Design an enzyme around this catalytic site. Structure first.
Site: not given
Ligand code: 3VN
Ligand code: 3VN
Ligand code: CL
Lengths: 297, 296, 296, 295
Positions: A46-47, A110, A136, A141, A165, A206
């Site tokens: 994502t980052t 989504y 994760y 999100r 995570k 992370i």
């Protein structure tokens, strides 16, 4: 036992140069992570703006991280998640074949799959590669939550799924996970609460902050792992402000801004729908990073 | 700063035929004292403050004070209200009847602003000279005491010494103790007693301790002694019953458990509180079978 | 079933020098009557039920009853509580003192189960003869009267005839009337008054109607005569004032607006409620410059 | 230029892992023959996430061709969380004959309101067909604010409205109170009528896959200001409208379509899968109260 990837880890930003991935800057930033005691790097999660990278670009960045960490102890936990299982399996296989040490696989965003579908999504991924898989969970999100039941089930039905995570800001869930399944590797995906997760048996982070302050996150993590909780907490307290402010706008908008202001990347570029912060938040980000010692190259 | 910390019990309020069972109540309080609890909290949320009259509320506090007199155990009296003149009244009684401090819940239902919260607590604090502990439980009040409001109150009022957090938000706990490490952060959420203690929390106000005072007390004191390995182990052990005791609104499950254990002789609430659903009845009965419950 | 529907007003409770301004109260009620309001609600949330004494709460009920006697305007007494004995006491008082019906908020803070909500309301309904209107507002109470519970109560208690919804859940409004079309759905959320009516709702209990009784009353009556295009028009016109009247917690803004309009003597609240910030004072003053405000 | 009225978020039938193109076409003609004003190929209900860009494009073409010769429009699903992807889909839809595009707010990466504006502006500037915004916070993790919606509606000629799937009727009031010129479209079947009665000009429906005739009747009754009739149908549909979201859409609708014999196999692409046994039974029971039109 399972093969694992733990310790201080950096969710790497993806520097763009004229809309294109600045490959040598990418390598340089990874070298800076390695030199500052980081145990593993996470290319294109994502980052790293995995959403706006092409599949081919995504694969390139994974390669770069692998080649940069080659000849070092630093592991490469490749971002390999997708909301389509056939895509995630494709990324897992690439990461496997190209020398990644493991994969981070975000819960499908989504399409809001059921716990049953989450189970099969991950079971599929895990039964396609040799390498360790880190789950994760980031409901804010994705729109879905991998329950504790599903996480533990996946851990107990798939050899190479070794942990999760967590980025749900739910310390109670963290207690739940490690009390019922104390073999799994709980990894903090939320910097502000790095120390609380570690002190409850979490085994790494992370981090977004470690992009800017790798020495401090690494020290926090290793202090905690050697049970020096007072010093781990000291750092976690010092970092709270910037840990928050790196989220004043959606990550990775603030962290990339900070990197730019610190002279660690040449230009402040995002791919749409991501863009620069407001000039107000730009100043806010400049404000907080002035209160920290920032390692150079 | 004078303070009240350590292992603390949010006491249930036993009823007999709809009246406060004052004999069972005091007998339940000394069961806490014998098992090493540092302080008792009479008539809070767990003690059904909502459905007690002001006179019954006052009776429970006095029984707590008197019962603890002669021991080391302190009384942090439940004195909160959503009307400031009611809370101040409760605090004044609490002080004048020998309580060591007050626990004052954030105003519920009427949803005061942060400025209204500050003045609510400044009023309360200025009416007594005993320690005051803020109580944040947004899920019940529809209101939140912000970190800033908490920190300001702590700094501006000599007798406000901290906050009982029951919000499931370890991030706020970090926020609180990073900017104001001098305050006393108390866990009002049993499941995560240890995570809160490990970040510098100095005590718990427990529901579980009604049933398992020895285990809750051992947990707290291990953490205060920086023996985090033992504190975590117990917190992990307690997790199942810590959750099941909130499978329905507290304190419906804890009263149910005290009933099954034979520690109270009837399972009686005041409406709108009532017996648990029978599926949750079964869960509670079968979960508590994995723990050793001390008697009188 | 006996019912109380149409345009209703959640009366503010004006204070002077810390006391209930009984004279201002009757004056505000007369003003409501003269602008086509069908019923008044004394002491709800808008009337600061939390900070009133039981004695004061009763005083305000009587006043509304007396002022409305002689008229065709009914009195829907706020009689809710988080303690069932308190709610029943208020219910009976209201019956005895001439209230046409009672509004009864879901128990706040102590968070009863659906079963507890059922027994809570069943107790209230059978203790009086008059109609009982349920009041759902989860944002303040911390609990939700489920659809099934509302409908079960409707079918089992002759005098419970509907619910005041303040949950912003239009899905739930469809649920209720699709399964039990005989019940009276009342809007408890000004901004979405029209959608509630157009789905078959039969009234509103309004905060805005304190300031603009003629517009709210017109909206409801246009709606009831199936003139939706007009009802929607007014609702659209009213959206700005409807939202700004909750820029801080109700009734802080509506009392501020009433003061700015010169309809009440002083801007006075009981703690933990207080005056709005200067900035919100400005916003409210700004917005109500757009509307024709009726005089005394 | 706009696309309004009764619209269907088309499910995408699968056969041996592949998109059953001809079953898809047949499903669309069934929609046309039951009074549907437009079909929405490959949005959320059409499993856009798990389709490849090639299958996504194939589906759009099928919808366009199947509708050619009719009054029925094709509002092509073209949303993405990467603007270069959404623009790609937008341009394809235009150049292959779609009447407009439905474009979901960027999911997962959570753009700022400024980013959302630049995202949709880039999309709106790339084609000349109507663009319908799509707001579904529960899935995307971000909300297009009322301001951003109204801003985009005004600054862009082709942005003509928004599909709202946020279960927030306050917002719907807000949108139409400040900008009545926009086309508010219901994306939440259970509250089709309330959205229509406040000025909404159509629906994009999941339920209409199964009951197209009833959804279009509801819509058209409402558009003809026959609110009494629209409400009665909306009340009758509440059972099926809710059960179709007992598991994540489109798991229940595809289950329902299968049970009704409208598609060959109950086949999803992972991470989507069959419903639980109990939900399978709940679905089977409720659709027994509705008359399901055939081909
Ligand atoms: N780093 C690799 C590229 C990422 C692609 C994508 N933007 C979209 C992924 C996708 N599953 C693709 C579907 C395309 C056809 N509808 C999606 O949009 O949901 C994402 O996952 O964020
Ligand atoms: N602890 C003993 C008192 C309990 C009383 C009360 N049930 C009601 C509190 C009250 N402020 C009373 C006001 C009555 C007049 N409307 C409330 O109902 O909000 C509560 O505090 O929850
Ligand atoms: Cl869709």
């Amino acid at each position: 036992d399972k093969n694992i990837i733990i310790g201080a880890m950096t969710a790497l930003i993806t520097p763009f140069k004229n809309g294109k991935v600045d490959e040598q800057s990418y390598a340089r930033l990874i070298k800076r992570q390695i030199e500052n005691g980081i145990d593993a790097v996470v290319p294109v999660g994502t980052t790293g703006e995995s959403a706006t990278l092409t599949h081919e670009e995504h694969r390139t960045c994974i390669e770069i991280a692998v080649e940069t960490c080659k000849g070092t102890k630093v592991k490469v936990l490749a971002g390999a998640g997708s909301n389509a299982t056939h895509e995630a399996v494709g990324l897992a296989k690439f990461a496997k074949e190209h020398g990644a040490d493991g994969i981070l696989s975000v819960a499908p965003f989504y399409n809001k799959p059921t716990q049953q579908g989450l189970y099969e999504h991950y079971k599929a991924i895990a039964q396609s590669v040799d390498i360790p898989v880190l789950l994760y969970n980031v409901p804010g999100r994705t729109g879905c939550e991998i329950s504790t039941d599903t996480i533990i089930k996946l851990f107990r039905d798939c050899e190479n799924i070794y942990g999760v995570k967590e980025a749900s800001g739910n310390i109670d869930k963290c207690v739940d996970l490690l009390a019922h399944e104390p073999r799994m590797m709980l990894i903090s995906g939320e910097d502000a609460i790095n120390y609380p997760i570690l002190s409850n048996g979490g085994k790494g982070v992370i981090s977004v902050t470690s992009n800017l302050l790798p020495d401090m996150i690494s020290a926090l993590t290793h202090f905690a792992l050697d049970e020096n909780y007072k010093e781990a907490k000291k750092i976690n307290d010092e970092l709270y402000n910037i840990n928050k402010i790196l989220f004043c706008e959606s990550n990775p908008i603030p962290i990339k801004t900070a990197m730019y202001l610190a002279g660690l990347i040449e230009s402040l570029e995002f791919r749409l729908p991501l863009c620069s912060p407001s000039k107000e938040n730009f100043a806010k980000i400049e404000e907080v990073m002035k209160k920290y010692k920032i390692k150079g190259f």
